Structure formats: structure tokens, C-alpha cells
Amino acid sequence: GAMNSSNYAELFNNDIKLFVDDTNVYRVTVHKTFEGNVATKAINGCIFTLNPKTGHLFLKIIHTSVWAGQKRLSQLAKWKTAEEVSALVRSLPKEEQPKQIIVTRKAMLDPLEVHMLDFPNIAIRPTELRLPFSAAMSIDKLSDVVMKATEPQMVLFNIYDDWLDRISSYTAFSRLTLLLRALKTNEESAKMILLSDPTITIKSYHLWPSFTDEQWITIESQMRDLILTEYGRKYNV
């Protein structure tokens, strides 16, 4: 059944599972036409497919050519997502295939279930959590590879950098959730927090800065400050 606060610990057990977020697959800019009508122009997108235990991110880049000549693109996007997740699973050795796939939006359930009929032993689950994976395109290196792509492409990342050398996957996911929640509520402020000190750099093979343990506590506090504020600045409190 659904994944929620009550069964949150299950994410970090030893059953392989993947989150799938489809919120950045079909992306458009809306603009005026010469005749004064409105039109959309698609831009490149991505499927965000994440193992929360290991940090392994399978970023399938969705090039705009996949939408050419197609109708009802928001519906097609869900089916394209399910086609690509199904292809990913079939590409993995049996012992690496997930036992569960958790979709962040319930509209992905039927598309994924139909594409995975061959895998009756993989559970497709929704979640009651409002996980902030849509903000993945605020991570500069991820946005960069998506926008530069000229063809369909799969790129593999560890979204935890090397954190698992020092913290648990439970703590790693909590840190990722705080960073993504910050970036989604106030991207400019969040990014100022992360880069302000020019002496802390991002390694070439990493996504986030090389904070010491103590600096991560400060950073996380600052992210905790931003989110509670914006929640005032929004509701006036």
C-alpha cells in the first residue's frame, strides 16, 4: 500500500526499491505568437529515478524530439516515463532489479503497472509524502546535463556524493530532503546558502559542496531557517 510517515523506515532496509518522479519529464515555456495567441515550446526534461538506500540516481534525459508530432503530451509523458522505467528494470541483472517502485504522483500508477505486467513480483506503490524531487532541476550539474543533451541519454549519479562514508542512508535522505525542500521554496536563497563561502568547493565528481560535519550542521540549520521563514513570508506569521 501507500508509503507514508508510519512506514518511512522501510526506505532504508535491504529490499531494493526505487522512487520514480515524473514532474520534470514534460517541460514547456508558454509564449505569445505573432497573432497574439499562446503557444508552448517544449524544453528537455528528465525522469528522476532514485535508490534511497544507496543514493544511485538513474537520470533519463527526455529530449524534445520525443514529443514531435504527438498529441496529449501530458498524458503521453506518463506513459513515456513508465516505458523508460520498465526498460531500465529489464536492463538490470535480476539481482539488481527492485522489489518495489514508489511513484511520487498517483497518476503514474496505472501507466507503470501496465508496463510492468511482465514483473508481477515488483510492487508499484504510491506515497502520501509530498517529497520535493521536482526541485532536482535546481541542482546545477543536473540541470546542465539535461539542457545540453542533443539526443536521448541516461546519466548515472550518486545524489549523496560521499555522505554514506560518514552517515546512514536514513540521515543522507533527511539531508537530501532538507536541501530539496529549501531549493523548491526559495531557490535563490537556498543557493546563496550553499555557495556563499567560496572556500568550500564542489568536487568534480560531486553534486554538492564538500562540507565538513560541522559545516553541514550549520548549513542544515540555515536551510531549516529558510523553510520556516518562507512559510511565514507566505502565510504572514
Partner 1 sequence: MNTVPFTSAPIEVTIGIDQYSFNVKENQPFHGIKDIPIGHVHVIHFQHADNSSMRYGYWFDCRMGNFYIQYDPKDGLYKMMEERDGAKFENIVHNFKERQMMVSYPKIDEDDTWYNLTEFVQMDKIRKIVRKDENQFSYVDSSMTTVQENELSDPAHSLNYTVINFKSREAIRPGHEMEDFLDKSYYLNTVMLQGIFKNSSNYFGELQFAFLNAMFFGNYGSSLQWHAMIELICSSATVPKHMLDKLDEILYYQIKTLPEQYSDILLNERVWNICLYSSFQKNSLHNTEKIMENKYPELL
Ligand X SMILES: CN(C)CCn1c(=S)[nH]c2ccsc2c1=O
> Using CB under 6 A, which of 174, 196, 201, 212 touches ligand X?
174
CB 25 within 8 A of CB 81: yes
Reduced DSSP (H G I as helix, E B as strand, rest coil) percent helix, strand, coil of the chain, to 5: 45, 20, 35
Give me the least distance between CB of 86 and partner 1, in Å please: 8
Q: How far apart are CA 214 and CA 237, in angstroms?
A: 30
Size of interface with ligand X, in residues (CB under 6 A): 4
Q: How far apart are CA 142 and CA 202, in angstroms?
A: 13
Please report whether residue 137 would count as binding partner 1 according to CB under 8 A. Answer: no
174 touches which of partner 1, ligand X, none (CB within 5 to 8 A by kind)? ligand X
113 touches which of partner 1, ligand X, none (CB within 5 to 8 A by kind)? partner 1
DSSP letters, 22-69, are -TTSSEEEEEE-TTS-EEEEEE-EEEEEE-TTT-EEEEEEE-GGGGTT
Of residues 146, 171, 184, 142, the one with CA closest to residue 159? 142
Report the residue number, 84 or 161, with the smaller CB distance to ligand X. Answer: 161
Question: Which residues contact residue 9 at a Cβ distance below 8 angstroms, ignoring those fewer than 6 apart?
Answer: 170
Could you give the 3-state DSSP secondary structure of residue 195?
A: helix
Size of interface with partner 1, in residues (CB under 8 A): 11
Stretch that binds partner 1, among 46-54, 78-86, 125-133, 159-167 (CB under 8 A): 78-86
> Using CB under 8 A, which of 10, 73, 97, 113 touches partner 1?
113
Q: How far apart are CA 236 and CA 233, in angstroms?
A: 5
178 touches which of ligand X, partner 1, none (CB within 5 to 8 A by kind)? ligand X
197 touches which of partner 1, ligand X, none (CB within 5 to 8 A by kind)? none
Contact residues: ligand X, CB under 6 A? 174, 177-178, 224
Contact residues: partner 1, CB under 8 A? 76, 79, 82-83, 110-111, 113-115, 117-118
